[PDB]
Symmetry: D2
Subunit: 394 residues, 4 copies
Amino acid sequence: IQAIRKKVETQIDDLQNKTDEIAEFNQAKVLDAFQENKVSDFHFHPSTGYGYDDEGRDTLERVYATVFKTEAALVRPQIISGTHAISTVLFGILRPDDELLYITGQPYDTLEEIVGIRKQGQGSLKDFHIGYSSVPLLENGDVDFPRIAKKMTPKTKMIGIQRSRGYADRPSFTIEKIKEMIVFVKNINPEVIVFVDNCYGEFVEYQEPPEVGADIIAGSLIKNPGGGLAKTGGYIAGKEALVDLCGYRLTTPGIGREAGASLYSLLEMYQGFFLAPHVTAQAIKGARFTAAMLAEFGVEADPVWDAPRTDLIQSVSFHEKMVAFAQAIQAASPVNAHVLPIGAYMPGYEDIMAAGTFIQGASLELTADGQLYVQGGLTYEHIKIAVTRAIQKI
Amino acid sequence: IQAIRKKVETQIDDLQNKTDEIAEFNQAKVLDAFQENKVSDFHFHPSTGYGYDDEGRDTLERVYATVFKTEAALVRPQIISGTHAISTVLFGILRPDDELLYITGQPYDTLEEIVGIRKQGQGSLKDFHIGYSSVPLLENGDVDFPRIAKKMTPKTKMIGIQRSRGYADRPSFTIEKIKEMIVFVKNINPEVIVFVDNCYGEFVEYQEPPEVGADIIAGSLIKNPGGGLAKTGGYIAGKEALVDLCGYRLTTPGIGREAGASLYSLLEMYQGFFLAPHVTAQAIKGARFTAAMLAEFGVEADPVWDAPRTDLIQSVSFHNKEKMVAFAQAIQAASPVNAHVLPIGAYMPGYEDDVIMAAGTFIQGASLELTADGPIREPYQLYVQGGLTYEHIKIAVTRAIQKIV
Amino acid sequence: IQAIRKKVETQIDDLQNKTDEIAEFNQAKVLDAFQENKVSDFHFHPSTGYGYDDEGRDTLERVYATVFKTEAALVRPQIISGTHAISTVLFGILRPDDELLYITGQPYDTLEEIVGIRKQGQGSLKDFHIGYSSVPLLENGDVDFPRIAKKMTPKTKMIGIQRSRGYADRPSFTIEKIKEMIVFVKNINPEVIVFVDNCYGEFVEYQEPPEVGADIIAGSLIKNPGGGLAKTGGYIAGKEALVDLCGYRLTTPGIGREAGASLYSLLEMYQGFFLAPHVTAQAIKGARFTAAMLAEFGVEADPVWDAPRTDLIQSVSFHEKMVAFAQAIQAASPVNAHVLPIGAYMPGYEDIMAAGTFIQGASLELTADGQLYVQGGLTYEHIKIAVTRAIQKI
Amino acid sequence: IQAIRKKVETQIDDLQNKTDEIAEFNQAKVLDAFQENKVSDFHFHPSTGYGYDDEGRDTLERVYATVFKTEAALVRPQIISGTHAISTVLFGILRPDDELLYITGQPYDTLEEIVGIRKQGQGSLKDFHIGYSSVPLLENGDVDFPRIAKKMTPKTKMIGIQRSRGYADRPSFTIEKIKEMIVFVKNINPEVIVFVDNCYGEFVEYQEPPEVGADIIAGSLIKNPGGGLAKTGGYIAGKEALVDLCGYRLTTPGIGREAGASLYSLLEMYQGFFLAPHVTAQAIKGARFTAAMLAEFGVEADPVWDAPRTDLIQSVSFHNKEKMVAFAQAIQAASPVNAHVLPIGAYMPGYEDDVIMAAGTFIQGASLELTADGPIREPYQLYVQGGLTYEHIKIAVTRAIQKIV
């Protein structure tokens, strides 16, 4: 009903305005990154073959490095997903006898395969004699500092930090919480490399992990940083020598990041990055609206409408009952709205994905998969319409 | 200053909210047009060669027709600009001895060569013995209804209506005003064809001209309906019989709109149209912000922040050349592309005065993106409009003000 | 059988070598056109929006103008076919009360609609008070000079000449024959504009029509000049003022040829044009092979294996009997070889098209439509394989 | 002179005909692989995002697998060069404590950093405790069979075979020679994996290495199999189990080859592969023409015009720096792109001597197109090879000869 919406929208308005203040601040950050890097229409021209001397590619990378406050970045179609970006960081820096310690609990399913927990013999970190372990989180979702200290050894080269919750039933970690865990691990071993899986958190806060001490980060271009325009990809941002090592893994030793034809992907990647702060804000404002609206009809939601926000994720715990709502999201989507989803094989996961989008699997666009994790939306308007209609079914 | 912004943003907030209500209504309209036409990822596939049976292309046109409430539409990368879409409408429908009557005064100057009022032998309406004349507007900007009646004759096949003011010193015409003039010309001749140049007006109001009686409309995809994503293009929407004639002009007679490969443009056109209501709202909210901000520093704004809105146009008159040029430059300096390439007064072919143009955009000449331009002459009126995000506009305009205040 | 092929290939070899001499000469013509125009990788960059100052587009046009020996050219995706290019020439130059006289008989069907013979009221030349008539050919296929003289009036602004036969049962006109008719009409009225529909004839001979006196020519990019790489389009080449008039028709008066975004079509158009002489040669050598092979099994063919060649067209008069051969060509094609064609609606024609190609409707690729008109083939090898298999069925 | 050309072209004509017989056989092989896999225009459609269930991509790979007579293949724009395809094969299959043995002598220098013989800590085979060594060739260029037997051990998981000579002073290895060495290593260990770097050898002979026993091969799409149309890419073909491991290395473990959007590259890859046998023949016929022409003017050619051919490589040794540099320049001057940008001896990272490179091509670094390069030092050997048409090669080489004779 309209009445409820006037009530709910009035209620969340001061928090929507704060989100718009962050949006403006992050629009300026990015706008100034383009200015500092002298972005020109010349930087959108395609490169072919080996891709040597592609200034457009190099300049996009420098723009990302400036926004994320890192010395360098790798932003390319050659990186095919968020997972491939993350995996490029792990094999790029880790060597036989090194250990990787995930301090934020067990990471999202697909990493289980990359590290070697599942799918042994396929070229995982274990297959190359690189160790891995994770530190379970406490009952309330905080990290376990004394156990973290106990599991760091002289062979611990890297500390992994997953910012966003994914499907975990724990809260996503805010920048401040990440800073706290970074100060802790660096106190114990100042030479340990801190890596943050940053997916879904780009532009949600004023800061990103490198400025609070992360050495290297990675993420997906079909989420926040793509602005809904990047057709594929991932990014890596961090210290120069670490990005160089990622590049030798992405291509080959000797060559590295100097090669890789950009083809026709530059314009959209630049434009998308420029739009990212604003589109991320739409997703966050829609998340708050969704959280608030679902709460009105009794549905459990997490984070609640007035909770701190660090990423795009919004869960809505029905705990079948949800079927009419996830399918309802697809039905309020622009693409394949008539193709009602169901449970099926999702490559890299052992276990109803609403994905009526312009780009296959992109999730900065309105999506719903599950307690349905209902995130994204390129416009605040689309999210309000879709959620209002989905609720009006359930 | 941030304090002045606090005042202006709170002052204009009720109207920014009204704009967002329109954006949601227009987002739903488009979202439901996609769903009615069963848009699938199958419709983004490229076509090569002749482009026959390109379902993606034909579906996009049906989506446009549904949103605009017309029987048909022609939306193609082959239409190279808004002007090319309008000219296609004019030559597609008009034949020797027919007369076209523009009732909203003299149209934007590039239609001059198309109708035959400037240059000779280039293949204008005059070269093909098609007549043209415009009815001047009354001193306050309203149409002159008695003269409209006087100038309509049995040879009048088409009535032209330019919605947006462009550079003309007159208010843009709201849907309500456009409905008024449609009712008037239809009462004189129910079979006269009414055409509305709809550029910059798309999604600014709840309605478009066809639903208030317009027979056919045209526009540019590098403005409102492109959503900032369309790289080129134009659209034509209206009665099927008329759209078919437009198609024979755009390609050739016989074949018409059945032909035309889409190549790689479908995705951006669909996505751009879906984002159009929202992006248009950003442009409108930034215009109101520019109008209210500039008024606080004693600079004349037209339209004023609380005026009704039907298109994206927004000007500020500085009455000082140095301030106009510095503001324009400051807009370029606050744009994402070529921000380091500051404009100056340049010679424009055909005009006696220099023009200044801030256009640091992703797409060349695209105007749903933030731009600033105007002729260097009294009253030193700069058109500061467009913007893909309300954020970019606020940042750019706040900085531009800091340069000249 | 292999034996027959050794016999037939030996027989046509001196004529295949002559075709390769023309190919080399035309490869040099084009190579030197690129050199004279300083073609650089900079000329392949995409333009967006209005397309103003697109040097890549302008340079491609100048390269075509140099190859065809004309002052200027219009080569763009904005021209959607050979017919649209031809029609742009007719409406571009003709005005009310002018007459167009086709001296090579009735042109290909679709032009009937453009001129106004069929489809009246759709914006044809007649609808804009431009007259048209054609001069029938003599029983043997030669033009009728005394009748041509009789039908030229003081209102005749343009003389149309269709080089290729199309579906007509007459021979295609060689450059020499075209020169003869040009000298004749210019003797009668030196101010008459000569226009040649040049489709299928590009690079088949040492010369093109402008060098023998044609004022303006037009053709299709999905035939000879595209090299099999152009995804769509047409071209117009001729005197500067005439090309300017074509441009005002293609876009609008005032603007003209200075506008029209190139998007991603430049690289393929350049590369295709560079490959055109060589690919055209493959098509001609395959035509000769086909003509020779069909004659071995008694099938009437025209032109015969040893006839003069001016275009890619090869007819093979069975006069049902042909069904197993046109469908046989599709079945020896790389794309949709399993989709056996049949008779159906061909937009712009009132009356079994084999079109298993990379580009929809492209005919520099091996195609067969009908007396089956069997032309094209991007490689001489493909044509030999396809024809040998098609014959082995019939 | 035209007279010398008359002599050379008639002299080499029987062999040019042999090359064309191979081209027709190879054109039929590919044409039948398209037909076996039911290639439709549906397979050229772009995929975005994750690229899951991209039938166009999966079908192209099946087409490659059919042509190469392997169980599977990986052909992707994500493979950025031939070197990247080979490295993907090496890291995809090798694990700590395994040893790779190159039996055709020291491979092309960029594999040095990949195996760990140059540079440290970049993530080479050595950094992951994978062993490597090469068996030098006998003085005449044949492989050293006794040493091959000696160096193979229980740790030897893979045998490397570089078909093309590259810049090495030794003949390229024909399919027949490659079969000989495969039989030899398989007789020592039937389970040893045989890998063949197949670059420049595609469609030059009737067979490829897998059908003579090679377990897996790799190459570059900007060489032979690209047909001059592929803008970037690499391919890997071989046993399914091995191709799967390569896929996990190229993307990530678990996911592997199921992921990777094709974007806009499918059409050119299919069309390029279809044209590959024919374009390769142009390159081979031009090489023979260059070899015979240069021999007539007293310039040493290697290979000679009547030598067997297994790859596109062709060199001419001038024994004079000025002639080598002028010839190379003349090749640039006779190329379609950047013909006005003449090369000179340049510094190449890692090498002590200057290198000269004529590369006026449509695609950057593409070598199925006509190029000319070599180190500036005795015996002043220039590699003049590739060419999309036999016509371009004849024109360019005839002109280059006129500059130095």
